[PDB]
Amino acid sequence: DDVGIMQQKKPPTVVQSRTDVFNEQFANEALHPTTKVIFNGLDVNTEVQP
Amino acid sequence: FVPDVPEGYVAVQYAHRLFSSSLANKRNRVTYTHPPTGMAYPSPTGRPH
Amino acid sequence: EAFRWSRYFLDELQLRRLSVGLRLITNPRIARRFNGVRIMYLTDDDPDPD
């Protein structure tokens, strides 16, 4: 139940970068759980609150 | 875990006869013809569950 | 009489051409700055810009 403290292991995070137009193909898609993510710069919560 | 199949799905045995070449908007797409409705769907998108 | 209106301090030929310019500057064909986009995931068989 407790909040984790040590850095947890995570699924690999493939970054789809969808544009105006693109040719989606699904050969060699991974079967393991995976994090689809559309944007590059998602480390957006920078401003720390002591 | 084995995800249960959803209420709307139709069971369909795979067979080489189901899949074929076809014209669809100037491309030779790999159409699948649904055995019940008989309808051909060239695109992987929009096929019946 | 020349003082009653500045006429924006432009010559009469300038105002006359100017009205034609105003016809030019509102023609729908020139208005190729477009406003707003629809985002929608969708196969692009048979494209047409319209």
PDB file of all heavy atoms in Angstrom, chain B residues 5-31:
ATOM      1  N   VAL B   5     -13.553 -11.947 -24.135  1.00  0.00           N
ATOM      2  CA  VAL B   5     -14.028 -11.317 -25.366  1.00  0.00           C
ATOM      3  C   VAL B   5     -15.324 -10.550 -25.110  1.00  0.00           C
ATOM      4  O   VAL B   5     -16.240 -11.048 -24.452  1.00  0.00           O
ATOM      5  CB  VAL B   5     -14.182 -12.312 -26.526  1.00  0.00           C
ATOM      6  CG1 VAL B   5     -12.828 -12.889 -26.887  1.00  0.00           C
ATOM      7  CG2 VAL B   5     -15.151 -13.422 -26.159  1.00  0.00           C
ATOM      8  N   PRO B   6     -15.388  -9.316 -25.620  1.00  0.00           N
ATOM      9  CA  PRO B   6     -16.481  -8.358 -25.421  1.00  0.00           C
ATOM     10  C   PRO B   6     -17.778  -8.803 -26.085  1.00  0.00           C
ATOM     11  O   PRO B   6     -17.759  -9.670 -26.957  1.00  0.00           O
ATOM     12  CB  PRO B   6     -15.938  -7.080 -26.057  1.00  0.00           C
ATOM     13  CG  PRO B   6     -14.446  -7.241 -25.985  1.00  0.00           C
ATOM     14  CD  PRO B   6     -14.244  -8.690 -26.298  1.00  0.00           C
ATOM     15  N   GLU B   7     -18.890  -8.230 -25.641  1.00  0.00           N
ATOM     16  CA  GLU B   7     -20.218  -8.716 -25.991  1.00  0.00           C
ATOM     17  C   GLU B   7     -20.503  -8.727 -27.500  1.00  0.00           C
ATOM     18  O   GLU B   7     -21.160  -9.637 -28.008  1.00  0.00           O
ATOM     19  CB  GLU B   7     -21.265  -7.855 -25.260  1.00  0.00           C
ATOM     20  CG  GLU B   7     -22.715  -8.267 -25.474  1.00  0.00           C
ATOM     21  CD  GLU B   7     -23.658  -7.631 -24.473  1.00  0.00           C
ATOM     22  OE1 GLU B   7     -23.198  -6.791 -23.671  1.00  0.00           O
ATOM     23  OE2 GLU B   7     -24.859  -7.975 -24.485  1.00  0.00           O
ATOM     24  N   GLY B   8     -19.971  -7.749 -28.224  1.00  0.00           N
ATOM     25  CA  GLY B   8     -20.339  -7.575 -29.618  1.00  0.00           C
ATOM     26  C   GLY B   8     -19.594  -8.398 -30.652  1.00  0.00           C
ATOM     27  O   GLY B   8     -19.946  -8.378 -31.829  1.00  0.00           O
ATOM     28  N   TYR B   9     -18.569  -9.125 -30.230  1.00  0.00           N
ATOM     29  CA  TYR B   9     -17.678  -9.781 -31.186  1.00  0.00           C
ATOM     30  C   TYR B   9     -18.286 -10.993 -31.861  1.00  0.00           C
ATOM     31  O   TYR B   9     -19.174 -11.642 -31.311  1.00  0.00           O
ATOM     32  CB  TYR B   9     -16.345 -10.154 -30.541  1.00  0.00           C
ATOM     33  CG  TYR B   9     -15.422  -8.972 -30.354  1.00  0.00           C
ATOM     34  CD1 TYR B   9     -15.766  -7.923 -29.506  1.00  0.00           C
ATOM     35  CD2 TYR B   9     -14.215  -8.896 -31.025  1.00  0.00           C
ATOM     36  CE1 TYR B   9     -14.929  -6.842 -29.329  1.00  0.00           C
ATOM     37  CE2 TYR B   9     -13.373  -7.817 -30.852  1.00  0.00           C
ATOM     38  CZ  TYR B   9     -13.735  -6.793 -29.999  1.00  0.00           C
ATOM     39  OH  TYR B   9     -12.907  -5.709 -29.816  1.00  0.00           O
ATOM     40  N   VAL B  10     -17.800 -11.272 -33.068  1.00  0.00           N
ATOM     41  CA  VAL B  10     -18.212 -12.440 -33.835  1.00  0.00           C
ATOM     42  C   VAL B  10     -17.030 -13.374 -34.000  1.00  0.00           C
ATOM     43  O   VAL B  10     -15.970 -12.953 -34.456  1.00  0.00           O
ATOM     44  CB  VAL B  10     -18.667 -12.052 -35.242  1.00  0.00           C
ATOM     45  CG1 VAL B  10     -19.309 -13.245 -35.919  1.00  0.00           C
ATOM     46  CG2 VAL B  10     -19.631 -10.880 -35.188  1.00  0.00           C
ATOM     47  N   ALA B  11     -17.204 -14.638 -33.630  1.00  0.00           N
ATOM     48  CA  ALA B  11     -16.145 -15.622 -33.821  1.00  0.00           C
ATOM     49  C   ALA B  11     -15.953 -15.899 -35.306  1.00  0.00           C
ATOM     50  O   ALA B  11     -16.924 -16.051 -36.044  1.00  0.00           O
ATOM     51  CB  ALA B  11     -16.463 -16.907 -33.070  1.00  0.00           C
ATOM     52  N   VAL B  12     -14.701 -15.980 -35.741  1.00  0.00           N
ATOM     53  CA  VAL B  12     -14.400 -16.241 -37.146  1.00  0.00           C
ATOM     54  C   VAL B  12     -13.110 -17.049 -37.255  1.00  0.00           C
ATOM     55  O   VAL B  12     -12.054 -16.585 -36.832  1.00  0.00           O
ATOM     56  CB  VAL B  12     -14.230 -14.924 -37.950  1.00  0.00           C
ATOM     57  CG1 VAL B  12     -13.630 -15.204 -39.312  1.00  0.00           C
ATOM     58  CG2 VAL B  12     -15.556 -14.209 -38.112  1.00  0.00           C
ATOM     59  N   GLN B  13     -13.195 -18.264 -37.794  1.00  0.00           N
ATOM     60  CA  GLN B  13     -11.989 -19.054 -38.030  1.00  0.00           C
ATOM     61  C   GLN B  13     -11.128 -18.365 -39.065  1.00  0.00           C
ATOM     62  O   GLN B  13     -11.638 -17.924 -40.090  1.00  0.00           O
ATOM     63  CB  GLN B  13     -12.343 -20.453 -38.531  1.00  0.00           C
ATOM     64  CG  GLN B  13     -12.907 -21.351 -37.461  1.00  0.00           C
ATOM     65  CD  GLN B  13     -11.982 -21.454 -36.275  1.00  0.00           C
ATOM     66  OE1 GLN B  13     -10.836 -21.881 -36.408  1.00  0.00           O
ATOM     67  NE2 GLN B  13     -12.467 -21.044 -35.108  1.00  0.00           N
ATOM     68  N   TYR B  14      -9.825 -18.285 -38.814  1.00  0.00           N
ATOM     69  CA  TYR B  14      -8.918 -17.760 -39.818  1.00  0.00           C
ATOM     70  C   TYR B  14      -8.863 -18.728 -40.985  1.00  0.00           C
ATOM     71  O   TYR B  14      -8.906 -19.939 -40.796  1.00  0.00           O
ATOM     72  CB  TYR B  14      -7.511 -17.545 -39.273  1.00  0.00           C
ATOM     73  CG  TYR B  14      -6.496 -17.337 -40.380  1.00  0.00           C
ATOM     74  CD1 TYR B  14      -6.318 -16.092 -40.958  1.00  0.00           C
ATOM     75  CD2 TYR B  14      -5.736 -18.391 -40.862  1.00  0.00           C
ATOM     76  CE1 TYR B  14      -5.407 -15.902 -41.970  1.00  0.00           C
ATOM     77  CE2 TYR B  14      -4.825 -18.207 -41.879  1.00  0.00           C
ATOM     78  CZ  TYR B  14      -4.666 -16.959 -42.433  1.00  0.00           C
ATOM     79  OH  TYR B  14      -3.757 -16.765 -43.451  1.00  0.00           O
ATOM     80  N   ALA B  15      -8.758 -18.185 -42.189  1.00  0.00           N
ATOM     81  CA  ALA B  15      -8.629 -18.986 -43.391  1.00  0.00           C
ATOM     82  C   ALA B  15      -8.003 -18.110 -44.447  1.00  0.00           C
ATOM     83  O   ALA B  15      -8.256 -16.910 -44.485  1.00  0.00           O
ATOM     84  CB  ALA B  15      -9.990 -19.455 -43.855  1.00  0.00           C
ATOM     85  N   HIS B  16      -7.206 -18.705 -45.321  1.00  0.00           N
ATOM     86  CA  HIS B  16      -6.591 -17.944 -46.401  1.00  0.00           C
ATOM     87  C   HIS B  16      -7.630 -17.354 -47.352  1.00  0.00           C
ATOM     88  O   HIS B  16      -7.362 -16.367 -48.030  1.00  0.00           O
ATOM     89  CB  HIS B  16      -5.581 -18.804 -47.161  1.00  0.00           C
ATOM     90  CG  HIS B  16      -4.378 -19.160 -46.350  1.00  0.00           C
ATOM     91  ND1 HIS B  16      -4.375 -20.197 -45.444  1.00  0.00           N
ATOM     92  CD2 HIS B  16      -3.149 -18.596 -46.282  1.00  0.00           C
ATOM     93  CE1 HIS B  16      -3.189 -20.268 -44.864  1.00  0.00           C
ATOM     94  NE2 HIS B  16      -2.428 -19.305 -45.354  1.00  0.00           N
ATOM     95  N   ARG B  17      -8.809 -17.966 -47.408  1.00  0.00           N
ATOM     96  CA  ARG B  17      -9.872 -17.483 -48.281  1.00  0.00           C
ATOM     97  C   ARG B  17     -10.427 -16.114 -47.861  1.00  0.00           C
ATOM     98  O   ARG B  17     -10.939 -15.369 -48.698  1.00  0.00           O
ATOM     99  CB  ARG B  17     -11.002 -18.516 -48.385  1.00  0.00           C
ATOM    100  CG  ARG B  17     -12.250 -18.168 -47.587  1.00  0.00           C
ATOM    101  CD  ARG B  17     -13.330 -19.220 -47.760  1.00  0.00           C
ATOM    102  NE  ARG B  17     -12.847 -20.549 -47.397  1.00  0.00           N
ATOM    103  CZ  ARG B  17     -12.826 -21.028 -46.156  1.00  0.00           C
ATOM    104  NH1 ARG B  17     -13.261 -20.283 -45.149  1.00  0.00           N
ATOM    105  NH2 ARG B  17     -12.369 -22.253 -45.922  1.00  0.00           N
ATOM    106  N   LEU B  18     -10.340 -15.789 -46.572  1.00  0.00           N
ATOM    107  CA  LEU B  18     -10.882 -14.524 -46.066  1.00  0.00           C
ATOM    108  C   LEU B  18     -10.157 -13.293 -46.601  1.00  0.00           C
ATOM    109  O   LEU B  18     -10.771 -12.255 -46.846  1.00  0.00           O
ATOM    110  CB  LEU B  18     -10.838 -14.496 -44.537  1.00  0.00           C
ATOM    111  CG  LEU B  18     -11.548 -15.636 -43.806  1.00  0.00           C
ATOM    112  CD1 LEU B  18     -11.276 -15.541 -42.320  1.00  0.00           C
ATOM    113  CD2 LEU B  18     -13.041 -15.609 -44.087  1.00  0.00           C
ATOM    114  N   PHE B  19      -8.849 -13.422 -46.795  1.00  0.00           N
ATOM    115  CA  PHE B  19      -8.015 -12.292 -47.185  1.00  0.00           C
ATOM    116  C   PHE B  19      -7.635 -12.310 -48.656  1.00  0.00           C
ATOM    117  O   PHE B  19      -7.317 -13.359 -49.211  1.00  0.00           O
ATOM    118  CB  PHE B  19      -6.770 -12.246 -46.307  1.00  0.00           C
ATOM    119  CG  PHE B  19      -7.072 -11.947 -44.875  1.00  0.00           C
ATOM    120  CD1 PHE B  19      -7.323 -12.972 -43.980  1.00  0.00           C
ATOM    121  CD2 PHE B  19      -7.142 -10.634 -44.431  1.00  0.00           C
ATOM    122  CE1 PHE B  19      -7.618 -12.699 -42.660  1.00  0.00           C
ATOM    123  CE2 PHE B  19      -7.434 -10.353 -43.112  1.00  0.00           C
ATOM    124  CZ  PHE B  19      -7.674 -11.386 -42.225  1.00  0.00           C
ATOM    125  N   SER B  20      -7.654 -11.139 -49.280  1.00  0.00           N
ATOM    126  CA  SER B  20      -7.403 -11.056 -50.715  1.00  0.00           C
ATOM    127  C   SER B  20      -6.920  -9.680 -51.147  1.00  0.00           C
ATOM    128  O   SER B  20      -7.017  -8.715 -50.405  1.00  0.00           O
ATOM    129  CB  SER B  20      -8.665 -11.435 -51.493  1.00  0.00           C
ATOM    130  OG  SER B  20      -9.827 -10.916 -50.866  1.00  0.00           O
ATOM    131  N   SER B  21      -6.361  -9.605 -52.344  1.00  0.00           N
ATOM    132  CA  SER B  21      -6.042  -8.325 -52.951  1.00  0.00           C
ATOM    133  C   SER B  21      -7.344  -7.664 -53.391  1.00  0.00           C
ATOM    134  O   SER B  21      -8.312  -8.353 -53.715  1.00  0.00           O
ATOM    135  CB  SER B  21      -5.113  -8.533 -54.149  1.00  0.00           C
ATOM    136  OG  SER B  21      -4.992  -7.355 -54.924  1.00  0.00           O
ATOM    137  N   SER B  22      -7.381  -6.335 -53.380  1.00  0.00           N
ATOM    138  CA  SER B  22      -8.515  -5.614 -53.956  1.00  0.00           C
ATOM    139  C   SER B  22      -8.189  -4.156 -54.270  1.00  0.00           C
ATOM    140  O   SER B  22      -7.287  -3.560 -53.669  1.00  0.00           O
ATOM    141  CB  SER B  22      -9.731  -5.678 -53.028  1.00  0.00           C
ATOM    142  OG  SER B  22      -9.453  -5.048 -51.787  1.00  0.00           O
ATOM    143  N   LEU B  23      -8.907  -3.597 -55.239  1.00  0.00           N
ATOM    144  CA  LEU B  23      -8.889  -2.159 -55.453  1.00  0.00           C
ATOM    145  C   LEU B  23      -9.622  -1.452 -54.333  1.00  0.00           C
ATOM    146  O   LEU B  23     -10.688  -1.887 -53.898  1.00  0.00           O
ATOM    147  CB  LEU B  23      -9.535  -1.784 -56.781  1.00  0.00           C
ATOM    148  CG  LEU B  23      -8.604  -1.155 -57.816  1.00  0.00           C
ATOM    149  CD1 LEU B  23      -9.389  -0.226 -58.735  1.00  0.00           C
ATOM    150  CD2 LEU B  23      -7.439  -0.428 -57.156  1.00  0.00           C
ATOM    151  N   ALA B  24      -9.055  -0.336 -53.899  1.00  0.00           N
ATOM    152  CA  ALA B  24      -9.697   0.534 -52.937  1.00  0.00           C
ATOM    153  C   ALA B  24      -8.949   1.844 -52.986  1.00  0.00           C
ATOM    154  O   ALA B  24      -7.837   1.946 -52.464  1.00  0.00           O
ATOM    155  CB  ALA B  24      -9.627  -0.058 -51.554  1.00  0.00           C
ATOM    156  N   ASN B  25      -9.553   2.834 -53.633  1.00  0.00           N
ATOM    157  CA  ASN B  25      -8.969   4.163 -53.722  1.00  0.00           C
ATOM    158  C   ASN B  25      -7.546   4.115 -54.249  1.00  0.00           C
ATOM    159  O   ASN B  25      -6.629   4.632 -53.615  1.00  0.00           O
ATOM    160  CB  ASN B  25      -9.014   4.864 -52.361  1.00  0.00           C
ATOM    161  CG  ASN B  25     -10.425   4.962 -51.805  1.00  0.00           C
ATOM    162  OD1 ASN B  25     -11.363   5.315 -52.523  1.00  0.00           O
ATOM    163  ND2 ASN B  25     -10.584   4.637 -50.525  1.00  0.00           N
ATOM    164  N   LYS B  26      -7.377   3.464 -55.397  1.00  0.00           N
ATOM    165  CA  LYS B  26      -6.091   3.409 -56.096  1.00  0.00           C
ATOM    166  C   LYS B  26      -4.973   2.746 -55.297  1.00  0.00           C
ATOM    167  O   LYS B  26      -3.819   3.170 -55.370  1.00  0.00           O
ATOM    168  CB  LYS B  26      -5.656   4.815 -56.518  1.00  0.00           C
ATOM    169  CG  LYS B  26      -6.670   5.520 -57.391  1.00  0.00           C
ATOM    170  CD  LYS B  26      -6.539   7.019 -57.295  1.00  0.00           C
ATOM    171  CE  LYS B  26      -7.529   7.695 -58.225  1.00  0.00           C
ATOM    172  NZ  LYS B  26      -7.339   7.240 -59.629  1.00  0.00           N
ATOM    173  N   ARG B  27      -5.316   1.706 -54.542  1.00  0.00           N
ATOM    174  CA  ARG B  27      -4.311   0.893 -53.867  1.00  0.00           C
ATOM    175  C   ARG B  27      -4.753  -0.558 -53.802  1.00  0.00           C
ATOM    176  O   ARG B  27      -5.942  -0.847 -53.656  1.00  0.00           O
ATOM    177  CB  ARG B  27      -4.054   1.399 -52.455  1.00  0.00           C
ATOM    178  CG  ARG B  27      -3.069   2.527 -52.354  1.00  0.00           C
ATOM    179  CD  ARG B  27      -2.654   2.690 -50.916  1.00  0.00           C
ATOM    180  NE  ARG B  27      -1.989   1.486 -50.430  1.00  0.00           N
ATOM    181  CZ  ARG B  27      -1.986   1.099 -49.160  1.00  0.00           C
ATOM    182  NH1 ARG B  27      -2.622   1.816 -48.246  1.00  0.00           N
ATOM    183  NH2 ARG B  27      -1.349  -0.005 -48.804  1.00  0.00           N
ATOM    184  N   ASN B  28      -3.792  -1.469 -53.909  1.00  0.00           N
ATOM    185  CA  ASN B  28      -4.094  -2.893 -53.860  1.00  0.00           C
ATOM    186  C   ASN B  28      -4.113  -3.403 -52.436  1.00  0.00           C
ATOM    187  O   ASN B  28      -3.217  -4.123 -51.992  1.00  0.00           O
ATOM    188  CB  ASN B  28      -3.092  -3.687 -54.684  1.00  0.00           C
ATOM    189  CG  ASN B  28      -3.511  -3.819 -56.117  1.00  0.00           C
ATOM    190  OD1 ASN B  28      -4.630  -3.455 -56.484  1.00  0.00           O
ATOM    191  ND2 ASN B  28      -2.623  -4.361 -56.944  1.00  0.00           N
ATOM    192  N   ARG B  29      -5.146  -3.014 -51.714  1.00  0.00           N
ATOM    193  CA  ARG B  29      -5.210  -3.331 -50.306  1.00  0.00           C
ATOM    194  C   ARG B  29      -5.655  -4.767 -49.971  1.00  0.00           C
ATOM    195  O   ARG B  29      -6.394  -5.404 -50.732  1.00  0.00           O
ATOM    196  CB  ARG B  29      -5.967  -2.215 -49.585  1.00  0.00           C
ATOM    197  CG  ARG B  29      -5.079  -0.955 -49.600  1.00  0.00           C
ATOM    198  CD  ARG B  29      -5.736   0.375 -49.192  1.00  0.00           C
ATOM    199  NE  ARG B  29      -6.127   0.528 -47.788  1.00  0.00           N
ATOM    200  CZ  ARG B  29      -5.463   0.074 -46.722  1.00  0.00           C
ATOM    201  NH1 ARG B  29      -4.328  -0.614 -46.837  1.00  0.00           N
ATOM    202  NH2 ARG B  29      -5.957   0.312 -45.512  1.00  0.00           N
ATOM    203  N   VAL B  30      -5.164  -5.264 -48.838  1.00  0.00           N
ATOM    204  CA  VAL B  30      -5.421  -6.624 -48.365  1.00  0.00           C
ATOM    205  C   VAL B  30      -6.804  -6.714 -47.721  1.00  0.00           C
ATOM    206  O   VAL B  30      -6.919  -6.773 -46.493  1.00  0.00           O
ATOM    207  CB  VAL B  30      -4.367  -7.038 -47.296  1.00  0.00           C
ATOM    208  CG1 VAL B  30      -4.370  -8.532 -47.078  1.00  0.00           C
ATOM    209  CG2 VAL B  30      -2.979  -6.580 -47.704  1.00  0.00           C
ATOM    210  N   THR B  31      -7.852  -6.714 -48.549  1.00  0.00           N
ATOM    211  CA  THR B  31      -9.233  -6.774 -48.063  1.00  0.00           C
ATOM    212  C   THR B  31      -9.576  -8.072 -47.296  1.00  0.00           C
ATOM    213  O   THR B  31      -9.123  -9.172 -47.642  1.00  0.00           O
ATOM    214  CB  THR B  31     -10.246  -6.534 -49.200  1.00  0.00           C
ATOM    215  OG1 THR B  31     -11.546  -6.301 -48.648  1.00  0.00           O
ATOM    216  CG2 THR B  31     -10.301  -7.727 -50.138  1.00  0.00           C
TER     217      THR B  31
END
